[PDB]
Amino acid sequence: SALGKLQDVVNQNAQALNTLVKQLSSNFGAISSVLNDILSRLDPPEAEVQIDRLITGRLQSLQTYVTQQLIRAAEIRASANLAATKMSECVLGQSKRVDFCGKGYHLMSFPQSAPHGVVFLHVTYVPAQEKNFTTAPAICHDGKAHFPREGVFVSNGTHWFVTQRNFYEPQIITTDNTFVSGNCDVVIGIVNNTVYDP
Amino acid sequence: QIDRLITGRLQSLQTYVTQQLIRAAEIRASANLAATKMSECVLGQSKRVDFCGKGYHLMSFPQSAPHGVVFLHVTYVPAQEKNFTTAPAICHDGKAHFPREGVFVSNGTHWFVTQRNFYEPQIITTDNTFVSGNCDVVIGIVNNTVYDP
Amino acid sequence: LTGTGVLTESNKKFLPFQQFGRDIADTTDAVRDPQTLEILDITPCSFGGV
Amino acid sequence: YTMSLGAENSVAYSNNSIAIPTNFTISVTTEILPVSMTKTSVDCTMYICGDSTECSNLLLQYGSFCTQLNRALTGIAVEQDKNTQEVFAQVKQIYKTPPIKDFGGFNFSQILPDPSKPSKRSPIEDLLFNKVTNGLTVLPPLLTDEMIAQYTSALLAGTITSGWTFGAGPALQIPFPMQMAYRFNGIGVTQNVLYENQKLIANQFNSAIGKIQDSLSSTP
Amino acid sequence: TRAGCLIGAEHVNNSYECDIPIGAGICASYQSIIAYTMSLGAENSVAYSNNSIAIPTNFTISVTTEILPVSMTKTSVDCTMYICG
């Protein structure tokens, strides 16, 4: 049942064709569903009435078939516009949109042809093996508040480091990866730690 | 007589099913939009303008509603703007200096560099500027000192 | 007035000149018995998908 | 009258002047989106004919029209449940908020579920549910309103306690001011601005959430 | 049930994932056929506190499939031949 979305469309179209062909077997209130039987059994004054009943029944069936065919065409056009958007944004580029190109942080994508369809292989990055750390918004040093340029302050219990947010890579808190704004009196939860200077 | 009643009621039922399918397509499009907003505004922060509310989108909250969803979009709106005199680059020691992330502003006598969406003036240093070329090329470059820590 | 239904007791108090009752969709859901002047609700007989 | 598009606002453009914001407003706005309809099914034979056998015998001359209409209505009915699954069931973990609501001044009581209500809805969701008022059958939805509210509560707990991390993998806990600072950096404003003005931002957020509840309670 | 009367399924007090949807929160599964109120997911209480963070130390490169229909079979019907031959 992996390919059920394409098979659903194929089954709906084949079932609509089978129903439209099957509707010719109905007489729609006439004496027979066969036109040759009516034309060989009856005079044209009453065969005109019987053929008229068959014509209005078959025309109603054909208009119904065209109506759901247009509705399914609108649905397939919307799905194809979505597929073209996914081809433009997931295959031809890297997308920041969450869950547009798979579950997780999207890295890249591969297109594959399918019968009346497309299959996107979304290669994504999933974080794993997370670990607790004690964190602080800022570091107080020399009466100044230090904030990370791109990372986050973490502590393993005794020592303070700065790391990138999506992967644990501890580094020494220096002036090169922090920036100074204001004193320590304003930021709630600021902690005392040294800031190394190269 | 029953045939006339049957064809009238069948025409009515086919009409009802036709607008029900059209409204189902419209509701499906709205629900696909709602799922996109749930994925991109609630489960993440969206850079798309006006997709998750008016202003710079911060975050969003989903709320259930009868046959629907209500998104509370929390956004950041700039306010209390102030005029400043600006320049594309700073000319110092025959070199052109450009901001790494901010913008050069002047309150009338002194030049600073600030972030673009909030006024926070800082001293123009070598740590928040980068050097590219001389002062002869950039149109509108002004003369100001660049501090070195 | 003919039909098929379950006839239960009704809390709708008719005015004395009124005999039948209709909802918004013009279906007879309340009626007065002519023998004893009491009001009966006409629930439709149960139908459902299997 | 001939209408007016808006007030004219002449932007004071010049080649060396810029306008820089010195303050901000935390603005909360509502967006209402329909998800599903009422699942209606119509017995075609009972609608056209009722209990008349002669009517159904004449109706069989027209073929499989009734099968087509019942199949279309069944497709609509399952499409509504598919829509509700696609909108609300995007998480397989039911996250819960901690019992202590210490989020650094941020108040979420108007959007978190109320324990005193038996429906386990938020006050905003309770107000939203209060403000919405012959062969035909109405199929009940697969997800009831309390389970949809449970899904929204799980999404709220995930986005409060973990930020956007639960939407991309395992839920990684993070303090809410730090998460807000990350969101501030996403829109290009430095973390220091958030930390220095955190009480003001929390007060503006609480005031905007209260104005949302008042505006929903005061607009028909 | 609120969907209707269910005959042949043993109602249980346990909650599982939905296998066969019945409606109004009721689902059916085979284990005999049982019917139950379904469960959205496992509860995952996030260990929130105001000064603790969780940082990933590893990653998984995950490839997922997404199937999207593009076109249908192009069908044309001769209306005169279909109605009349």
Ligand SMILES: *[C@@H]1O[C@H](CO)[C@@H](O[C@@H]2O[C@H](CO)[C@@H](O)[C@H](O)[C@H]2NC(C)=O)[C@H](O)[C@H]1NC(C)=O
């Ligand atoms: C936190 O991390 C630091 C740095 O990795 C650890 O400090 C080192 O610990 C090892 C093991 O005892 C010593 O050999 C090193 O000399 C330490 N380095 C310094 C600079 O002191 C620290 O032990 C870790 N703390 C915990 C609780 O895991």
Ligand SMILES: *[C@@H]1O[C@H](CO)[C@@H](O[C@@H]2O[C@H](CO)[C@@H](O)[C@H](O)[C@H]2NC(C)=O)[C@H](O)[C@H]1NC(C)=O
């Ligand atoms: C972090 O460092 C600051 C400054 O060194 C400490 O603030 C001092 O605290 C003592 C006693 O609490 C006072 O007598 C001083 O007047 C304070 N100085 C200043 C400049 O505020 C602060 O207590 C330290 N915090 C921790 C947790 O160690």
Ligand SMILES: *[C@@H]1O[C@H](CO)[C@@H](O[C@@H]2O[C@H](CO)[C@@H](O)[C@H](O)[C@H]2NC(C)=O)[C@H](O)[C@H]1NC(C)=O
């Ligand atoms: C532009 O900003 C600078 C920096 O804030 C101002 O310079 C300071 O002005 C105050 C007020 O007179 C003095 O007390 C300081 O000593 C000045 N600092 C320096 C380094 O000179 C400057 O006045 C502002 N200009 C205008 C027109 O507002």
Ligand SMILES: *[C@@H]1O[C@H](CO)[C@@H](O[C@@H]2O[C@H](CO)[C@@H](O)[C@H](O)[C@H]2NC(C)=O)[C@H](O)[C@H]1NC(C)=O
């Ligand atoms: C900015 O500084 C440059 C260099 O100090 C100035 O350029 C000099 O201008 C004078 C008179 O206009 C000339 O005699 C020099 O030969 C120029 N030197 C160079 C290296 O170009 C420039 O005029 C200054 N601009 C302003 C507005 O003060």
Ligand SMILES: *[C@@H]1O[C@H](CO)[C@@H](O[C@@H]2O[C@H](CO)[C@@H](O)[C@H](O)[C@H]2NC(C)=O)[C@H](O)[C@H]1NC(C)=O
């Ligand atoms: C920045 O300066 C410009 C021009 O000095 C200001 O624009 C004027 O604003 C006044 C007050 O509304 C109007 O009467 C003028 O017609 C405006 N002039 C032009 C050319 O638009 C502008 O208001 C200033 N910005 C701020 C934030 O003070």
Ligand SMILES: *[C@@H]1O[C@H](CO)[C@@H](O[C@@H]2O[C@H](CO)[C@@H](O)[C@H](O)[C@H]2NC(C)=O)[C@H](O)[C@H]1NC(C)=O
């Ligand atoms: C930025 O705007 C906020 C309001 O959005 C200002 O906060 C108000 O300040 C006045 C006067 O200080 C108080 O009476 C109000 O009670 C404050 N409102 C809130 C919600 O706290 C703030 O002062 C502004 N800051 C600047 C620098 O202009």
Ligand SMILES: *[C@@H]1O[C@H](CO)[C@@H](O[C@@H]2O[C@H](CO)[C@@H](O)[C@H](O)[C@H]2NC(C)=O)[C@H](O)[C@H]1NC(C)=O
């Ligand atoms: C968070 O917001 C709620 C609602 O605004 C606050 O609850 C109010 O508390 C005051 C004083 O205790 C009462 O007079 C109100 O009736 C309460 N409102 C409601 C709707 O119950 C609550 O105090 C705020 N703070 C916290 C920490 O929850």
Ligand SMILES: *[C@@H]1O[C@H](CO)[C@@H](O[C@@H]2O[C@H](CO)[C@@H](O)[C@H](O)[C@H]2NC(C)=O)[C@H](O)[C@H]1NC(C)=O
């Ligand atoms: C981070 O620490 C918290 C609390 O110290 C851990 O949460 C506990 O995990 C155990 C094991 O699953 C549960 O039995 C407790 O109920 C949890 N407590 C709370 C308050 O949720 C958490 O597992 C730690 N994270 C990591 C990655 O080790």
Ligand SMILES: *[C@@H]1O[C@H](CO)[C@@H](O[C@@H]2O[C@H](CO)[C@@H](O)[C@H](O)[C@H]2NC(C)=O)[C@H](O)[C@H]1NC(C)=O
């Ligand atoms: C990160 O996860 C990978 C697996 O995704 C780990 O790689 C496995 O390591 C074990 C023991 O070292 C081996 O037996 C497996 O064969 C490895 N698998 C693969 C696919 O190489 C890796 O060790 C983990 N790293 C850390 C630091 O936890």
Ligand SMILES: *[C@@H]1O[C@H](CO)[C@@H](O)[C@H](O)[C@H]1NC(C)=O
């Ligand atoms: C965090 O909570 C503890 C109490 O659990 C409190 O002592 C501390 O001041 C809080 N820190 C911040 C930054 O809110």
Ligand SMILES: *[C@@H]1O[C@H](CO)[C@@H](O)[C@H](O)[C@H]1NC(C)=O
């Ligand atoms: C800006 O315009 C003024 C005239 O209004 C002109 O003197 C100046 O050179 C211009 N600067 C730039 C950078 O175009």
Ligand SMILES: *[C@@H]1O[C@H](CO)[C@@H](O)[C@H](O)[C@H]1NC(C)=O
């Ligand atoms: C019919 O008779 C019964 C008792 O025989 C009486 O209670 C009832 O009121 C009568 N109907 C009318 C319309 O008077």
